[PDB]
Amino acid sequence: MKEFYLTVEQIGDSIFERYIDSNGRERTREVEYKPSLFAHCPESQATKYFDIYGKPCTRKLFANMRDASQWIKRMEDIGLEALGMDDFKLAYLSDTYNYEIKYDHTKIRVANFDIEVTSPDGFPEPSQAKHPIDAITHYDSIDDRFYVFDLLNSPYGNVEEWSIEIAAKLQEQGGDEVPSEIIDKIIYMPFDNEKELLMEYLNFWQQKTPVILTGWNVESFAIPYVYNRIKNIFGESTAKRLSPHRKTRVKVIENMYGSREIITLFGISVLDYIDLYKKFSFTNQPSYSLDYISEFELNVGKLKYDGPISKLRESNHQRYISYNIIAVYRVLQIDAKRQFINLSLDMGYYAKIQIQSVFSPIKTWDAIIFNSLKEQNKVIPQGRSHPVQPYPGAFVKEPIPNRYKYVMSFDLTSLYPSIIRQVNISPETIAGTFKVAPLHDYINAVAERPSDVYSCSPNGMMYYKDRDGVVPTEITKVFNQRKEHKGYMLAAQRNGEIIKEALHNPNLSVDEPLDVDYRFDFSDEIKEKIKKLSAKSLNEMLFRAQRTEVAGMTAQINRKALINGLAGALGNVWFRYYDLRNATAITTFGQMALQWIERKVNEYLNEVCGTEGEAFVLYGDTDSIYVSADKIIDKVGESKFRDTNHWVDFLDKFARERMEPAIDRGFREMCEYMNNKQHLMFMDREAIAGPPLGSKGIGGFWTGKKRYALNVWDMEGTRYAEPKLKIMGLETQKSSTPKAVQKALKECIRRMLQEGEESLQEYFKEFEKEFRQLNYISIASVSSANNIAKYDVGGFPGPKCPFHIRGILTYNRAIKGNIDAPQVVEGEKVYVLPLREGNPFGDKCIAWPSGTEITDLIKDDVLHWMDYTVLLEKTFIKPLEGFTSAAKLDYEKKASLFDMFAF
DNA sequence: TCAAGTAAGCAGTCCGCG
DNA sequence: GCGGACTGCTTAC
Ligand SMILES: O=c1ccn([C@H]2C[C@H](O)[C@@H](COP(=O)(O)NP(=O)(O)OP(=O)(O)O)O2)c(=O)[nH]1
Ligand SMILES: [Mg+2]
Numbered sequence: 001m002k003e004f005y006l007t008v009e010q011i012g013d014s015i016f017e018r019y020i021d022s023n024g025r026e027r028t029r030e031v032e033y034k035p036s037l038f039a040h041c042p043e044s045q046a047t048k049y050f051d052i053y054g055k056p057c058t059r060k061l062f063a064n065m066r067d068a069s070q071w072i073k074r075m076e077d078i079g080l081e082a083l084g085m086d087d088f089k090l091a092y093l094s095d096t097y098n099y100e101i102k103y104d105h106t107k108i109r110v111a112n113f114d115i116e117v118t119s120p121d122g123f124p125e126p127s128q129a130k131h132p133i134d135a136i137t138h139y140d141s142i143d144d145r146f147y148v149f150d151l152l153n154s155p156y157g158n159v160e161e162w163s164i165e166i167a168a169k170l171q172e173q174g175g176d177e178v179p180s181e182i183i184d185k186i187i188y189m190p191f192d193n194e195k196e197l198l199m200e201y202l203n204f205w206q207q208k209t210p211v212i213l214t215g216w217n218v219e220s221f222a223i224p225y226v227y228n229r230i231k232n233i234f235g236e237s238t239a240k241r242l243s244p245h246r247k248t249r250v251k252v253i254e255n256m257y258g259s260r261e262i263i264t265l266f267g268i269s270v271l272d273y274i275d276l277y278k279k280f281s282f283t284n285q286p287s288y289s290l291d292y293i294s295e296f297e298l299n300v301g302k303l304k305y306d307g308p309i310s311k312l313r314e315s316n317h318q319r320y321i322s323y324n325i326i327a328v329y330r331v332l333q334i335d336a337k338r339q340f341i342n343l344s345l346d347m348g349y350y351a352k353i354q355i356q357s358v359f360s361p362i363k364t365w366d367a368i369i370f371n372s373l374k375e376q377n378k379v380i381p382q383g384r385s386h387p388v389q390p391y392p393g394a395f396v397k398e399p400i401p402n403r404y405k406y407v408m409s410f411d412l413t414s415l416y417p418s419i420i421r422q423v424n425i426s427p428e429t430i431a432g433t434f435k436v437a438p439l440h441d442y443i444n445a446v447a448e449r450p451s452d453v454y455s456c457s458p459n460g461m462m463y464y465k466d467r468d469g470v471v472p473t474e475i476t477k478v479f480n481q482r483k484e485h486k487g488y489m490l491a492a493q494r495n496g497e498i499i500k501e502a503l504h505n506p507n508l509s510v511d512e513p514l515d516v517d518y519r520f521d522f523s524d525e526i527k528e529k530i531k532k533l534s535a536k537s538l539n540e541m542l543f544r545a546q547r548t549e550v551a552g553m554t555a556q557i558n559r560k561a562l563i564n565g566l567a568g569a570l571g572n573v574w575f576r577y578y579d580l581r582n583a584t585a586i587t588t589f590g591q592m593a594l595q596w597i598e599r600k601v602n603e604y605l606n607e608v609c610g611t612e613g614e615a616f617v618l619y620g621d622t623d624s625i626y627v628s629a630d631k632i633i634d635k636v637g638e639s640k641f642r643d644t645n646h647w648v649d650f651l652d653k654f655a656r657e658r659m660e661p662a663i664d665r666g667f668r669e670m671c672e673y674m675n676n677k678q679h680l681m682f683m684d685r686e687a688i689a690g691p692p693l694g695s696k697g698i699g700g701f702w703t704g705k706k707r708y709a710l711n712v713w714d715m716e717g718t719r720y721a722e723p724k725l726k727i728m729g730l731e732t733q734k735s736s737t738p739k740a741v742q743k744a745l746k747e748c749i750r751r752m753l754q755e756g757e758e759s760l761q762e763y764f765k766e767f768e769k770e771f772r773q774l775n776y777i778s779i780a781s782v783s784s785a786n787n788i789a790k791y792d793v794g795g796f797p798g799p800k801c802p803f804h805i806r807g808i809l810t811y812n813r814a815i816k817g818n819i820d821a822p823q824v825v826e827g828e829k830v831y832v833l834p835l836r837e838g839n840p841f842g843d844k845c846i847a848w849p850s851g852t853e854i855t856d857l858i859k860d861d862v863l864h865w866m867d868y869t870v871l872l873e874k875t876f877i878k879p880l881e882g883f884t885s886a887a888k889l890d891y892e893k894k895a896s897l898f899d900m901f902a903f
Numbered sequence: 904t905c906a907a908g909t910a911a912g913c914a915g916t917c918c919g920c921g
Numbered sequence: 922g923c924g925g926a927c928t929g930c931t932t933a934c
Contacts, residue, residue, distance in 0.1 A: 255904050262905095279906085284931075361907045393909030394934065415934090416908090561907090564934090568908030575907080587909075621910090622934045706911060706933050729912070729932060736914090736931065783914095784930065786904080800916055802929060827904050874914085882913095 004103045005096070006211045008089045008354060009245065009266045013064040015092045016245045018211065018267060020107045028244065033092050035068045036061050037084035038379045039075075048377050052428035052470070057083060057379045083379045085370050093352045094371050101349040110141035110341060111210035112273075114327045115222045116320065118156045118313045122819050126221055127261055129228035132156070132194045134313060135321055136201060136226075137328045140208050146182060146328060147204065149197050150190045150321055159317035161190045167322045171304075176322030182329055198230055202241050209244050212269050212341065212355060216290045216331055219262050219272040227263045243267050257787055258826070269355040273331050276340040279359065280558050284735045286782040286829060287851025294330045297337060303327075308820060337547060339554050346555075347562065361565030362575050365474075369577070372474050381427075386573040391584050394622040395591040397598070399702040401886040404618055406629035407700050407710055408655055409687040410601075410663065412593065413680075414482070414560060415623035416567040417475045419589050422671065422680040424455050426469020427577045436460040439588070442673075443595040449673060456674045457585035458592045465677045471577070475563050482559035488519035489552025493718050495522050496545040499530065499538055500721040506535035513540040518548035593670065593681060594620050600666030601625060604659070609635070619702060624686065627659075633690075644693040648713045655685035687726060688714040696756030703730075703886040711753040725750060731879040740771075740778035741875045748880055748891070757889045764880070764891045771876075772868045779871055780831035782850055788826055797843075807832045807847030814841055814858050821855050824848065834874070839865040 006018040006026065015033040020026055038049060041058040049057045062068040065088050075082040085091040116135035117124045124131045134151040150162055168183050169175025178186075191197035215222055227248070231239035240246045244267035251264045274288055285293065291302040303323050305312055313320045335341050348355035351367040358364060370380050412418065419425070431454040441447035442458045454462035463469070495518050511534050516526055530538070569575040571583035598617045605616040609631050619626040629651055641647045660683075667681035689710035691697030700710040707729040713720060725746065731737045732746045744767050751759040771779070783804040791801040795813050808824050815821035824830055829850035835841055840861060848854045854862055884891050 251905095253905055257904085260904095275906090278904095357906090359906045363906085365907085391909080396910060396933085565907040571908050583908075624934085704912070707913095728934095731913090733933095734913090734931060784904080786929080800928070803915055804929090879913090 001104065002099065002102060003097075004101050004349065005093060006108060007244075007267050007269055008093060009247070010065060010089050011245060011247055011266065013066055015089060016267060017092075017096075018244065020104070024104070024107055026107070026109075031092070033065065033088065034061055034063065035065055035085075035088045035091055037068055037071065037082055037086070039083065040081065049379050050377070051083060051379045052373065052381065081382050083382055085380060086382070087366075090353065090367050090370065094374055097352060101352070103345060103349050105342070105345060106142075108141070108211050108345070109208065110212040110214065111138060111208070112141075112328055112331055113138040113213075113215050113218065113222060114324055114331075115225060116313070116324050117225065118154065119310055120156065120820075123823065124225070126224035126228055129225055129232055133198070133226065133229055134194075135324045136197075137324045138201075138204075139328050139332065143208070144185060146186045146325055148186060148188045148321065148325060149201055150188065151194055151197050152190050153192055154194065154313075157314035159313065162188065162318060162321040164188065166318055167325075176319055176326075178322050178325055179329060182325075186325065195233060198233065201226075202230070202238070205242065210268055212271055212345075213265075214271050214273050214276070214331065214341065216327070217272065217274050219270050219275070220260065223265070223270065224261065224263045227265075255827070271341065271344055271356060271358075273334070273340070275359065276344065277334070277338070280340045280343060280554065281338065282557060286735045286739075286831075288828075289851040290327060290330055292851040294334065297334050298330070300330070300333075310820060337550055339551050343554055343558055347558075361562065362569050362572060364562065365566050365569055366576050368474050369470055372470050381576065383574070383576045384578075386578055388573055389580060391571055391580050391587070392591075393587050395594050395620070396622065396705050397617075397620040398705060399619040399708070401701075401703050403698040403701045403887040403889075404626075404628055404630075405699040406633050406651070406690040407618070407626055407687070408629045408651055408659075408685060408689070409624055409626045410655075410659070410683050411624040411686045413682040413684075414479055414563065415590060415593075416586055417479050417563040418680040418682070419457075419586050419593070420475055420567065421472045421479075422455075422676045422678055423457050423585065423589060423674070424463040424465065424469055424472055424677040425457070425461075425582050425585050426463070426471040427579060427582070429463045429467075429469035429472075430581065431462040431464050433460045434462060439592060439595075442592050443599065445596075445669075445673060449675070451675050453675075455676045457589040458674070459581075459584045459588035461581055461585040463677075465675075468677075471566065475566055478559055478563050482556050482563065485552055485555035485559065489549055489556050490716065490718065491521050492518045492545050492549035492552055496542060496549060497718060497721050498522055498527060499542045499545060502530050502533070503535065503538050503542070504721075505531075506538055507532050509534050511537050513537045513544070516541075518545045519552065589674075590623065593667075594623060594625070596670050597663060597666055597681075597683060598625055601627060601659070601663065604662040604666075605631075608658070619708070621706065623683075625683075629690075638693065641693060644690075644713065645719075647690070647693065648688050648719070651688050652685070652714060655688075660684055686716055687712045689726070692723070692754055695754060696758070697754040698752055698756065698887055698889070700753060701883065701887040703882050709749050709753060709883075723754065725753065730883070731875075736782050737879075738779045738781055738871075738875050740774045744771075744876060745879060745883075749883065752883065752887060752889070758893075760884070760889070760891055761893050767876070768872070771872060776833065776863060776866060777831065777853070779868075779875075780833050781875060782829055783832060783847075784827070785824060785830050785847070786827055788824065803845060804830060804832050804847055806843060807845040810835075810841050810843040810846045811848050814846070815855065818857065821857060822849050822852060833862065834867040834870040835862075835865045836867045841865070 001024055003022055004020055008017045015031045018028045036059050038057040038059055041056050043056055047056045047058060049059055051057055072082045114137050115133055117131050118134055119131045132154050134154055136149040138147045152159055167176045167178040171177045227239050227242055240248050243265045247266035249264045251262050252259050253262060294300050295302060305319055307315055344355055344358045347358045351364045352371055353363060353367045373380055434450045437447035439458055450456035451462050455465050456462050514529055567586050570579055572578060598620055602616050606612055606614055616627050617625050618628050632654060663683050668679055671679040689700050689712045691699040702708040709727040709730060712724050712726045727733055732742050747763060748760055751763055785804055785808055788805055788808055791798045791805045792809060797806045797809055808830060830847040831850050832845060832847045834845045846862060880891055
């Protein structure tokens with residue numbers, strides 16, 4: 001096999017690399033790497049190295065990396081550009097792995113761990129590490145074993161050994177219900193004291209040194225706690241054994257309103273799963289506790305236990321350890337589903353960066369572009385300092401608030417990357433400028449043609465057409481990967497609907513799920529076999545199809561995020577290729593494209609309908625248009641359709657055979673108008689939406705920009721067994737909206753779109769009557785909480801104090817002096833409830849840490865004083881009033897009337 | 904919330920609006 | 922009480 005790196009670091013004048021050799025073995029080496037950098041030189045000087053603008057460069061080879069860094073400094077002193085890759089380890093990787101890396105994940109040691117620390121005086125701060133570590137569970141991917149380190153003797157209590165027998169039993173049997181599939185994979189090690197525990201953990205770490213290190217909050221808690229605890233007990237040299245190169249650094253991470261410390265372990269790649277999740281999941285969660293996320297992702301129940309965690313070890317050490325084990329397994333289960341580790345490895349090895357650099361789109365693209373240019377003996381420019389400047393973005397059309405019965409949407413394929421490719425936007429392809437007219441003039445095709453030589457954007461930029469720029473070339477490669485995975489995702493989605501249909505008529509039999517590849521549309525043979533399967537087998541197949549879809553989603557959406565990130569990086573001052581000319585060339589072209597095609601679609605439909613000056617495009621945002629299809633349906637007459645699926649087929653055919661060819665013609669003309677390099681504006685049908693045939697449903701509505709709902713029957717070729725609500729921006733979609741309120745508002749919307757006004761009125765009446773019975777957590781609002789201190793004046797709200805912050809201050813006064821009460825954490829999220837006048841808390845609201853039950857110290861009083869009236873008005877009625885007013889209907893029945901008497 | 908971008912909505916404070 | 926100037930937070934894209 002070809003070799004591949006595991007980790008790389010620069011330590012002084014040495015590169016330290018861990019790698020897998022040609023025989024599949026892990027090895028480590030220290031290389032006295034001599035870096036090269038470049039300076040411009042005279043033409044009369046024969047060279048093979050040229051900068052991206054074709055200017056000749058001389059290569060300077062340095063005796064060592066320190067000399068190279070010093071030369072860069074002196075070049076700044078002189079006032080001359082120092083060209084080349086200044087991050088020497090990336091240059092090292094480029095030289096050492098000068099080929100497309102094929103990695104073998106089975107050879108990479110991925111460690112997943114979690115620790116427990118009993119603390120009787122509040123949250124145990126990792127920077128102090130003053131309490132014993134009393135449990136560590138460490139899963140190793142190569143061994144496929146959970147290694148459990150259990151402290152039996154501590155100043156906070158001496159306990160008996162954990163029992164694997166009781167751990168396996170059902171909770172109804174008094175057990176901990178540790179999943180049976182991992183019971184045989186646990187290796188349990190009890191310790192008589194903490195020094196022995198930690199010395200053994202370090203010896204173990206030396207034998208099985210993680211390459212990828214993950215877990216939940218490991219970067220902010222577990223890692224620094226272990227490091228600092230060992231440092232406190234044994235000293236610095238021992239703690240540094242956590243690094244394979246015995247090198248660590250305290251890293252200060254700054255944010256707008258403060259900073260925190262982490263520990264960098266040279267030679268390890270830490271990928272904290274909470275951060276992988278936040279980056280790759282495309283969720284915004286009301287809480288990021290492992291229990292909350294596990295429930296959301298896996299539908300597992302939260303780990304139950306009596307009393308506070310600070311007393312759990314002494315009261316129930318059995319459960320304490322079992323829950324530490326389960327915590328590690330939960331992260332493994334989330335990854336089995338989401339596959340974020342796989343994704344990180346793919347991206348990291350593709351770019352040739354430290355794996356943890358996947359968190360930085362700028363570092364990722366810097367490396368991809370550097371490797372691409374290096375292959376042509378080209379030399380990258382030096383990064384420069386730029387002042388931050390705002391610049392313009394996408395166009396969003398103002399919709400007329402209203403119901404919209406039949407709607408068809410269209411959207412451009414990966415817009416910004418396609419614009420980069422079409423126009424040929426790149427640092428080195430800038431050809432010049434042209435005198436710009438008002439955007440309106442280009443949209444209406446009355447401005448004079450920008451250029452008859454170069455490819456243009458309506459921001460005034462021109463680009464070469466003789467050769468692709470490095471940005472277009474490299475963005476295309478990642479786009480093509482994204483396209484492949486999106487294909488698998490959609491097939492799995494379509495396959496899912498096939499199974500859902502079959503689940504309506506399952507066979508009464510005992511059988512097994514079919515062995516199929518869900519990434520490809522089911523063949524006729526498979527479909528025939530599916531109709532003869534039991535419900536048990538069908539549901540298992542559905543689960544597998546959905547997991548396949550999720551894997552496809554992870555792979556496709558995050559590759560799209562990467563290429564969108566390149567477009568955005570052009571507008572970030574820290575990017576080597578930062579250039580507002582290029583950033584704005586993309587966004588401005590996007591604004592034109594959207595409004596150009598709005599005009600073309602309107603013109604086309606006015607022609608087909610024999611109307612004039614009517615607006616068929618009701619809305620658009622960035623790269624999508626929404627088209628009213630009422631008139632199209634009406635030309636046939638709703639009476640001629642057999643069922644809902646019949647008119648859906650009709651619209652699907654109309655979009656593909658009539659509208660899309662017209663759309664293509666429009667964009668081809670725009671391409672010629674801008675003299676672009678390649679036509680890549682590909683816009684096809686996305687959604688088909690409308691009410692169920694014969695119903696009083698309204699189909700859809702808009703309240704304003706970025707706020708709408710549609711009853712969708714077909715989404716990009718996936719025909720749904722049951723209609724699916726597409727709701728964007730509305731309160732149902734916001735993590736700040738109470739859980740039970742999201743549910744209720746969604747049902748109100750469903751009834752509006754599918755059933756009509758009377759159905760909505762019936763549901764509203766019921767919810768209003770019963771909502772006071774809802775669990776307090778399900779009706780609490782949620783908010784991030786920043787700058788708590790700023791608004792704290794003697795424990796009371798200062799001027800302009802935000803409502804959620806006021807709630808936190810109320811909470812803080814209520815638990816004052818209690819060292820065991822949960823503390824609100826600056827920057828994290830809280831639940832918020834309004835309080836009735838005259839309450840003992842002394843203010844109109846209270847807030848506590850999100851994802852948790854409010855402390856028993858005050859719970860009863862909070863429950864007693866909750867202001868249900870205010871809660872309902874703010875979170876439910878106000879938003880519903882917005883939906884219904886926009887849709888021109890009433891959630892409460894109006895005077896009959898027509899009572900007229902009895903009945 | 905360390906880590907590519909902009910557009911734009913709603914809640915809430917403060918306070919004018921004769 | 923509504924709504925502009927402002928902050929804070931959250932979406933869509
Ligand atoms: O996080 C984002 C999202 C979108 N955008 C821009 C770029 C993107 O091309 C455009 C449209 O975004 P979408 O992801 O909604 N769709 P896109 O057209 O990029 O891909 P596709 O439609 O093929 O899924 O908005 C960003 O810059 N950052
Ligand atoms: Mg698109």
